Amino acid sequence: MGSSEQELKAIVKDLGCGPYFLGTYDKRFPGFVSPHKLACAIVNTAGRETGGVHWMAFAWNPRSKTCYLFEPFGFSDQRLKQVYQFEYESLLRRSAIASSPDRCITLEKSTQSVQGPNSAACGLFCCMFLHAFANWPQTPMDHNPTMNLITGVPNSMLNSPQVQPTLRRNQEQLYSFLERHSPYFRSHSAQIRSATSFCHLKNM
C-alpha cells in the first residue's frame, strides 16, 4: 500500500521531469551536486532497510540557488523529526557546498498540508509538485497551473470539519491530473487509487 519506487519513477518520467530527475532515494539522499542544472528527487523519510514510510520531494534551482522541500503535510522541522525521525541538515549543507560558489542557498519549504491525515497519496502528490517544478522552477509551490489545482491548509486544522471538503477535493484533483498527464497512471488507475486512497490508513 502507498506507492512504490517503480511507480513514482514511471509517473515522474511521464510528467516530463526526466531531464532533471535524479531518482528515488531513502533518507540518506546525499543532496544536490548540480551548480548548473535543475535537479529534483523524491526522498523517503526512512531508510531502505524499513521498506519506506513517507515521501517528500526535493528540488534545486541553480540559478536562484534555491532548494525546495515539498513534504505533503507541510510539517515543521520539529514535527518531521518527532513524527518521522527525519532531518535534512546534512543534505542541505552538501548541496550548498557542491552547488553554490558562496556555500549559501535559500531553503523554501511548504508550510501547509495538501494531504488528508489517513491518506496514502504522499508519493503521488510529490510527483505532481515535480511537474510544477520542471515547468515553473521559480514558483513551484503555488501560482502555477499545476499547483493551483490543489489547496494547502494549516497542518493544525487537519481533523477539523471546515477543511474536509478541501482535502477531499485535493486528492480527487491529484488523480484527475495523473489521468490527464500519465499513461502509466491511466493503465494502473484502479490499483493505484485503491493503494493510495484518502482513508487508506483510517483507524478501525
Binding site: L92, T106, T111
Partner: peptide, 11 residues
C-alpha cells in the same frame, strides 16, 4: 497550491 517559508542558509 501551498504557502511556504524561505530561510537563507550559509555553510
Amino acid at each position: 497550491g501551498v504557502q511556504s517559508l524561505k530561510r537563507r542558509r550559509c555553510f
